[PDB]
Design a protein around this ligand. Structure first.
Ligand SMILES: CCCCCCCCCCCCCCCCCC(=O)OC[C@H](COP(=O)([O-])OCC(O)COP(=O)([O-])OC[C@@H](COC(=O)CCCCCCCCCCCCCCCCC)OC(=O)CCCCCCCCCCCCCCCCC)OC(=O)CCCCCCCCCCCCCCCCC
Ligand SMILES: CCCCCCCCCCCCCCCCCC(=O)OC[C@H](COP(=O)([O-])OCC(O)COP(=O)([O-])OC[C@@H](COC(=O)CCCCCCCCCCCCCCCCC)OC(=O)CCCCCCCCCCCCCCCCC)OC(=O)CCCCCCCCCCCCCCCCC
Ligand SMILES: CCCCCCCCCCCCCCCCCC(=O)OC[C@H](COP(=O)([O-])OC[C@H](O)COP(=O)([O-])OC[C@H](COC(=O)CCCCCCCCCCCCCCCCC)OC(=O)CCCCCCCCCCCCCCCCC)OC(=O)CCCCCCCCCCCCCCCCC
Ligand SMILES: CCCCCCCCCCCCCCCCCC(=O)OC[C@H](COP(=O)([O-])OCC[N+](C)(C)C)OC(=O)CCCCCCCCCCCCCCCCC
Ligand SMILES: CCCCCCCCCCCCCCCCCC(=O)OC[C@H](COP(=O)([O-])OCC[N+](C)(C)C)OC(=O)CCCCCCCCCCCCCCCCC
Ligand SMILES: CCCCCCCCCCCCCCCCCC(=O)OC[C@H](COP(=O)(O)OCCN)OC(=O)CCCCCCCCCCCCCCCCC
Ligand SMILES: CCCCCCCCCCCCCCCCCC(=O)OC[C@H](COP(=O)(O)OCCN)OC(=O)CCCCCCCCCCCCCCCCC
Ligand SMILES: CCCCCCCCCCCCCCCCCC(=O)OC[C@H](COP(=O)(O)OCCN)OC(=O)CCCCCCCCCCCCCCCCC
Ligand SMILES: C=C(C)[C@H]1Cc2c(ccc3c2O[C@H]2COc4cc(OC)c(OC)cc4[C@@H]2C3=O)O1
Lengths: 171, 80, 105, 167, 120, 347, 110, 98
């Protein structure tokens, strides 16, 4: 067949969000609140193109907007966030429910210094709409032309010409 | 209807408790008002990603953000 | 005989477990969902005789997704030439294929 | 050596069947089938079928081979056996030598000789085992399957009580 | 053979287009033979239970003849329908493929040379 | 056996055949065969004697081995196609294993070695069920997989069944074994025309079921299981000898009887496909089963026999046995050839 | 991986203790015994009822095997169908028990 | 293809040849039959888990349940033979040769 095209290693260099999973899980509700638009443009491009090579730049925007999400935490509320993700980080299942007062301190300092409202129960699971400028893929599966169907039956049904025509049976 | 029932409750109380609990388990979800909320909670549980829609221009019932007031809500679950 | 009771009565007895491209619990795709979808949409309605010869490429792509014989054959060829150049000494593994580079994300 | 562990279990699985299809007695045939069920269960567990592996342990070994050993106890109180055993073992070890010296073999089908760790998938499934939710789908999507299986088991109870009566 | 035809509307004994075909008359000789099979069935039924063969159960022989004619009428309708479908598919396939059925040129016997084999 | 339980078990036999006939998923095909076997095992053990236990054990082992080979065929189909539709198979190894497994379920040669034994050990009604109703489901699966059936395998199995069913019944005095070798020969006749025209396969199946049902119903009506007890029938009921005469002449294929109808059509559908030698030697072998039928009705049905004095007691009692559908089945098993173009309703 | 370590450790400790138990008093030279049971040498008669309770276990264990994915099946979105099939399976287990009851299959080991 | 599939099929064919021509205990034949079922379970499980075809995960349990019910049926036949001859030797099952 053909050669599969791959992007170069410079096309894959972006500054990584090099924080732990409890750090990501601690700020995840405010992350889904504040980093909505580039994340949803990326996941729309990712379910529509069905190809990650066509989804690099939007992904870079994700990694552009996540870092600016954490810098904006690090400039303002580094200590209550640190006290919060440490308590998230203790738990083996990483329970939100074991960590409600540290969550309250982090949410208080974030609403005071950044004005961010934490999403409620049922908001980040909504199907939202995304206004992009990229065109709709007319053939995301790269499917070739389908075979033409067999001709259907038409014409009025006539009797059998002289019956069964089986050796001597005249009907 | 009460002579046979008292007779089987005096002879076989294990089977009377068995048929009674089985009958309650059969008929009671058709009478409970909370059976609707079981269905509602099991469809409100987001196991998958809420895959976004391309904004065609006319989808007023679809939000543009999770914190927008339109869309499905879970206030019925936060209150109960 | 195939007395098609399920289509005559309009009931779905066992069409759901029949293919991998059907509706799965929690929208789980199979690994060869796209290939099986392409081959089913190729071979639909044209009959099996025309399907065996006119949908050969989709069926070969789908069978090779299922069994991965060509992919394992290519990995065998690359790993065997690599083992030969390691035994001869004309090749050395890079630090990202020896485990000395502290992976990306 | 640890990368081929599924393969290694499969060899024991083949050996286990030649362990009991040689048939010294239904006693030792049952013992060989129980060891074979354990190692094939290890094969199943190493692909992520944890519920199906515990169905091998709970239902096949813990449920059914118990009844085979029970009936072997109550109802049933060399050269051919050992020869068939060593014959099948020589056949299987020559197959292992072929597929390890060649990394390709054809007995009936064409078979690769690398390990089956390559043929997996690189994704995740979120907060569920896909195999667990597919078995949970027996009650939501598998209605007709539950109907025919429950009717077959009810008929199975009735049929056992018919033919064990003798009247 | 024709199993892809009656797979779009399966389990139809008589389809709707079967109503465009002429139904058999009640004096169809096939249907009269089926009624004679019913009369033979009534006679064998009186023979195997030691009844008077031509005398006993005239209502029973009447229901034998009636039931065989009743079943055979719809069986003959389906028979005529399936041969009509066979000819319809044949003719529509010949019309949709003119290259496979060429109009071969009719030569009269004045051009056709046949070898004479004398009987002597 | 309790008649309610008998009704439930017969409905489960019918239900398993229906599940094999209607289902689109191979697992449900396998389930229908499992249900059918599990339900038919008590019908064979109705009288509770050691011959029925031997027959049921042999039937269990053959149908269980066939069911495991069927599931292995389905599983190789899943390897090489990733799906489960009951249609053509996607591997010749699955094709061979499923043809072998269905040949074991039908009793075709070389897996014929249970059909004369099991039919001998079980009563006449359960042998009727075995030789008629248990043929419907594997012929349905063979009807749906015929784009994948290897021609050489199905013709080898077919002509081997026809030869073994021909040369196995020459030696037989037991009526159930004559019917069983006749079963093996007729399944060869059904499966040899399968890849040419499956409508004639269905025609042979229905005419065979009618003639076999006629023969077992006459056997139950006379309570005769051997040739010599069949010879003692004319002094009790003379019409029953006439009916076993005309029905055994029909099962071998005499014109102008109805059992000549399928196989003639089968020859008529094998010379279209330019096979001349194969239906020729096939009907040569059918002449041998017709020939021992003509010995088994000339020597031992027509010319009247020495009787016993206790038969003169049995003159004073009529048959109270429910001979269900027996005149209809006897007319249909003999006098149906003028309606030979009825076969188009099976298309 | 750590599971196989644990299983192998338990099998190793059991085999160690069983071998020490079978061979620490075999160091002793105690005495050699000749020693020349309720039944003497009669063949073990088959008990039909023991086989019937074993097969009844096997069939109800299969019905249990069908019942086993119910905590996961309660998480479905088709709860009416799921609840119906769950009650149907436990009812069919109860019907198999009722037929085992009323046909005297549960007698003398009731 | 996959190499573990060859071993599972070879196990199936070993137990299939163990079922077919030995003429031994009947229980040994039932053991070979359930070894065939065991290898079918393992092979169906590895295929369905390999392809991530979720709806067929309930398929091997079905393959277990029916066949184990089948196994129960076979044991009862054996017990009837064990109530007739005192042994399960299949050469006692030769009444129906004539
Ligand atoms: C009609 C044909 C089928 C009849 C079957 C029953 C015959 C019968 O019972 O006869 C006795 C009966 C008279 O007897 P009975 O006094 O009442 O009592 C009988 C004694 O008890 C009998 O005394 P017994 O039993 O005490 O002792 C004598 C003994 C004597 O027994 C013996 O000696 C043993 C047998 C000797 C050797 C065999 C001889 C031949 C018999 C078989 C036929 C073979 C050739 C057939 C063709 C080749 C295929 C093999 O047994 C008998 O005679 C038994 C009685 C029956 C004899 C006849 C049986 C014929 C059945 C076979 C032919 C039909 C089926 C196959 C056809 C195949 C294709 C054509 O005769 C008839 O009923 C004949 C019919 C007469 C009326 C005809 C009216 C026609 C009306 C036409 C219009 C109506 C239809 C309209 C249709 C359209 C409507 C819309
Ligand atoms: C379509 C396929 C139909 C296949 C046959 C269906 C019925 C037979 C199967 C079930 C069965 O055994 O039923 C008993 C069965 C009697 O069978 P049997 O015990 O062998 O008969 C011996 C004596 O007749 C026993 O006599 P009995 O003393 O007990 O009382 C006389 C009895 C009393 O009758 C009644 O009581 C009936 C009135 C009440 C009915 C129920 C109402 C609720 O009348 C009859 O039995 C007269 C003969 C009935 C006709 C039998 C053959 C039917 C046609 C078979 C298909 C032929 C196709 C030829 C194709 C040729 C071209 C290829 O049938 C009936 O009692 C009623 C038959 C009604 C036929 C309806 C036809 C139209 C269907 C649409
Ligand atoms: C305005 C509206 C109302 C108008 C009303 C008008 C009518 C009023 C009168 C009502 C009655 C109508 C009767 C039916 C129509 C005429 C049927 C006819 O003559 O067909 C000629 C038919 C062919 O002649 P054709 O010159 O081409 O057609 C003249 C007409 O246009 C015939 O029409 P076609 O050209 O369309 O013929 C179609 C085709 C013409 O046939 C063909 O193209 C050739 C295929 C024929 C079948 C060959 C099978 C050979 C192997 C089996 C042999 C079995 C053994 C022989 C019989 C043994 C005893 C059963 O038929 C078939 O293929 C069907 C099979 C034959 C059925 C014949 C009718 C039977 C009814 C009575 C049954 C009693 C037994 C009869 C003989 C059974 C054997 C056939 O003759 C034969 O096949 C030979 C058999 C004799 C005919 C049956 C005569 C019916 C009346 C019999 C009364 C005596 C009964 C004595 C007691 C029972 C016997 C022991
Ligand atoms: C006794 C029978 C009891 C169960 C009857 C069916 C119950 C039911 O609601 O089934 C719905 C289910 C499923 O329907 P459903 O309504 O859940 O459909 C929603 C679609 N899915 C499943 C994809 C979420 O089954 C059917 O509708 C068809 C299959 C079974 C039909 C009944 C067969 C009875 C056989 C008796 C012998
Ligand atoms: C798991 C925790 C508990 C483990 C078990 C308990 C721990 C101690 C185990 C060792 C105890 C000593 C050996 C077993 C007991 C011996 C009793 C006996 O009769 O000994 C006489 C026997 C035999 O002595 P004998 O020669 O007089 O034999 C008498 C029999 N006649 C005369 C007929 C020959 O002594 C031995 O067998 C010696 C064995 C080794 C003794 C210990 C060596 C050092 C161990 C450290
Ligand atoms: C519809 C609801 C759901 C029903 C299905 C689910 C049932 C769950 C329990 C499963 C039980 C399985 C086995 C049941 C067998 C029943 C038949 C029975 O046991 O009959 C025999 C018994 C007499 O006992 P015997 O034969 O001697 O046995 C030795 C003990 N002495 O005779 C008896 O014990 C008489 C038994 C019949 C009377 C019982 C009445 C109970 C009423 C309770 C309140 C109403 C409950 C609503 C449902 C109606 C139930 C009848
Ligand atoms: C006696 C006749 C009783 C007929 C009852 C109704 C049967 C019916 O309608 O069957 C439908 C079937 C056509 O359905 P279809 O799916 O096309 O069949 C493919 C078969 N290989 O039609 C048929 O199968 C018609 C032929 C039935 C003949 C049965 C007796 C011989
Ligand atoms: C394309 C395919 C679609 C499907 C097509 C339809 C296929 C039909 C296949 C028919 C198979 C019938 C098998 C036998 C009937 C089933 C039930 C049964 O066994 O009834 C017999 C019954 C047993 O009663 P029991 O008390 O046990 O008798 C022992 C004697 N003391 O009672 C007796 O023993 C009484 C004696 C007489 C019994 C005669 C039964 C005849 C049944 C067959 C009728 C003809 C076939 C139908 C028409 C053709 C269809 C192809
Ligand atoms: C014993 C069995 C199985 C058969 C063979 C047999 C009979 C009964 C009668 C006869 C018969 O052998 C035949 C041999 O050759 C012909 C050829 C004939 O015509 C070609 C012909 O016409 C009536 C008659 C005959 C013999 C004849 O009467 O039953």
């Amino acid at each position: 067949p053909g050669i599969v095209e791959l992007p170069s290693l410079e096309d894959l260099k972006v500054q990584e969000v090099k924080v732990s999973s409890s750090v990501l899980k601690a700020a995840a509700h405010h992350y889904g609140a504040q980093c909505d638009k580039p994340n949803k443009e990326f996941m729309l491009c990712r379910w529509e193109e069905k190809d990650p090579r066509r989804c690099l730049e939007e992904g870079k925007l994700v990694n552009q907007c996540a870092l600016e999400f954490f810098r904006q935490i690090k400039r303002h509320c580094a200590e209550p966030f640190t006290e919060y993700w440490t308590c998230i980080d203790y738990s083996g299942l990483q329970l939100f429910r074991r960590c409600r007062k540290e969550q309250a301190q982090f949410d208080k300092c974030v609403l005071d210094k950044l004005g961010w409202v934490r999403p409620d129960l049922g908001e980040l699971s909504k199907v939202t709409k995304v206004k992009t400028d990229r065109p709709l893929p007319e053939n995301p599966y790269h499917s070739r032309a389908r075979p033409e169907p067999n001709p259907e039956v038409e014409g009025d049904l006539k009797p059998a010409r002289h019956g069964s025509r089986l050796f001597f049976w005249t009907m | 209807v009460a002579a046979f029932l008292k007779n089987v409750w005096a002879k076989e109380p294990v089977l009377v408790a068995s048929f009674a609990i089985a009958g309650l388990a059969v008929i009671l979800p058709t009478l409970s008002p909370y059976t609707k909320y079981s269905l509602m909670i099991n469809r409100a549980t987001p196991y998958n990603y809420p895959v976004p829609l391309r904004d065609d221009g006319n989808m007023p019932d679809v939000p543009s953000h999770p914190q927008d007031p339109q869309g499905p809500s879970l206030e019925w679950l936060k209150r109960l | 005989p195939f007395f098609d009771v399920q289509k005559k009565l309009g009931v779905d007895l066992d069409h759901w477990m029949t293919i991998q491209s059907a509706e799965q619990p929690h929208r789980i795709p199979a690994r060869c969902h796209a290939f099986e979808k392409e081959w089913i949409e190729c071979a639909h309605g044209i009959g099996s005789i025309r399907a065996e010869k006119e949908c050969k490429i989709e069926f070969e792509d789908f069978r090779e997704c299922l069994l991965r014989q060509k992919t394992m054959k290519r990995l065998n060829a690359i790993k065997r030439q690599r083992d030969k150049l390691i035994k001869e000494g004309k090749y050395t593994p890079p630090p990202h294929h020896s485990g000395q580079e502290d992976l990306r994300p | 050596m640890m990368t081929y562990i599924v393969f290694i279990l499969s060899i024991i699985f083949v050996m286990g069947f030649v362990g009991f299809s040689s048939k010294p007695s239904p006693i030792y045939g049952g013992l060989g089938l129980i060891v074979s069920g354990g190692v094939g269960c290890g094969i199943v567990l190493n692909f992520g079928g944890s519920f199906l592996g515990l169905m091998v342990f709970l239902i096949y070994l813990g449920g059914m081979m118990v009844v085979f050993g029970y009936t072997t106890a109550m109802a049933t109180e060399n050269k051919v056996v050992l020869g068939t055993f060593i014959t099948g073992l020589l056949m299987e070890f020559l197959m292992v030598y072929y597929v390890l010296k060649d990394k390709e073999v054809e007995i009936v089908f064409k078979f690769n000789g690398m390990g089956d760790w390559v043929i997996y998938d690189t994704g995740d499934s979120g907060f569920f085992s896909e195999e667990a939710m597919g078995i949970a789908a027996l009650y939501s999507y598998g209605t007709w399957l539950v109907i025919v299986t429950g009717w077959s088991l009810l008929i199975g109870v009735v049929v056992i009580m018919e033919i064990t009566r003798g009247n | 053979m024709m199993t892809g035809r009656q797979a779009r509307a399966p389990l139809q004994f008589l389809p709707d287009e079967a109503r465009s075909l002429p139904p058999p008359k009640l004096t169809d000789p096939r249907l009269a033979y089926i009624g004679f099979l019913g009369y033979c069935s009534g006679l064998i039924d009186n023979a195997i239970r030691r009844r008077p063969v031509l005398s006993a159960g005239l209502h029973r022989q009447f229901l034998y003849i009636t039931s065989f004619v009743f079943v055979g009428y719809y069986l003959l309708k389906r028979q005529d329908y399936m041969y009509a479908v066979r000819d319809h598919d044949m003719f529509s396939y010949i019309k949709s493929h003119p290259e496979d059925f060429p109009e071969k040129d009719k030569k009269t016997y004045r051009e056709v040379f046949e070898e004479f084999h004398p009987v002597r | 056996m309790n008649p309610i339980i008998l009704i439930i078990i017969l409905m489960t036999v019918m239900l398993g055949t229906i599940i094999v006939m209607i289902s689109t998923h191979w697992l449900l095909i396998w389930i229908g065969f499992e249900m059918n076997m599990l339900a038919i095992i008590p019908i064979m053990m109705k009288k509770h004697n050691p011959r029925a236990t031997e027959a049921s054990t042999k039937y269990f082992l053959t149908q269980s081995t066939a069911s495991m080979l069927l599931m292995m065929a389905i599983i190789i189909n899943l390897m090489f196609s990733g799906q489960w539709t009951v249609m053509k198979l996607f591997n010749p190894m699955a094709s061979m294993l499923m043809t072998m497994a269905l040949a074991m379920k039908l009793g075709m040669a070389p897996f014929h070695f249970w059909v004369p034994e099991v039919t001998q050990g079980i009563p006449l009604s359960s042998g009727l069920i075995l030789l008629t109703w248990q043929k419907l489901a594997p012929m349905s699966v063979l009807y749906q997989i015929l784009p994948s059936i290897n021609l050489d395998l199905i013709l080898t199995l077919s002509i081997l069944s026809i030869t073994i069913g021909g040369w196995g019944g020459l030696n037989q005095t037991q009526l159930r074994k004559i019917m069983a070798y006749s079963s093996i020969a007729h399944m060869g006749w059904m499966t040899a025309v399968l890849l040419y025209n499956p409508t004639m396969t269905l025609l042979n199946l229905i005419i065979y079921i009618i003639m076999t049902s006629t023969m077992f119903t006459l056997f139950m009506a006379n309570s005769t299981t051997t040739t010599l007890s069949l010879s003692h029938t004319w002094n009790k009921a003379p019409i029953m000898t006439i009916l076993v005469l005309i029905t055994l002449l029909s099962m071998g294929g005499l014109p102008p009887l109805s059992g000549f109808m399928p196989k003639w059509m089968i020859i008529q559908e094998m010379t279209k496909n330019d096979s001349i030698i194969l239906p020729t030697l096939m009907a040569i072998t059918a002449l041998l089963n017709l020939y021992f039928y003509m010995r088994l009705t000339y020597s031992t049905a027509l010319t009247m026999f020495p009787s016993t004095n206790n038969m003169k007691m049995k003159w004073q009692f009529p048959t109270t046995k429910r001979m269900t559908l027996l005149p209809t089945m006897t007319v249909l098993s003999t006098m149906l050839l003028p309606l030979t173009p009825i076969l188009s309703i099976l298309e | 991986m750590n599971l196989m370590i644990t299983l192998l450790t338990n099998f190793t400790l059991a085999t160690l203790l069983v071998t020490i138990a079978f061979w620490l008093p075999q160091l002793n030279v105690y005495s050699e015994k000749t020693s020349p049971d309720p039944m003497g040498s009669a063949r073990l008669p088959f008990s039909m009822k023991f086989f019937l309770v074993a097969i009844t276990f096997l069939l109800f264990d299969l019905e249990i095997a069908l019942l086993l994915p119910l905590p996961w099946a309660s998480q479905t979105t088709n709860l009416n169908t799921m609840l119906t099939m769950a009650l149907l399976l436990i009812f069919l287990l109860a019907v198999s028990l009722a037929y085992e009851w009323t046909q005297k299959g549960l007698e003398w080991t009731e | 293809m996959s190499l573990v599939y060859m071993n599972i099929m070879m196990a199936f064919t070993v137990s299939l040849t163990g079922l077919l021509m030995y003429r031994s205990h009947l229980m040994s034949s039932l053991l070979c039959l359930e070894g065939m079922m065991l290898s079918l379970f393992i092979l169906a499980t590895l295929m369905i888990l390999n392809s991530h075809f979720t709806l067929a995960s309930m398929m091997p349990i079905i393959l277990l349940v029916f066949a184990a019910c089948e196994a129960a049926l076979g044991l009862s036949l054996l017990v009837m033979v064990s109530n007739t001859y005192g042994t399960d030797y299949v050469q006692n099952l030769n009444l129906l040769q004539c």
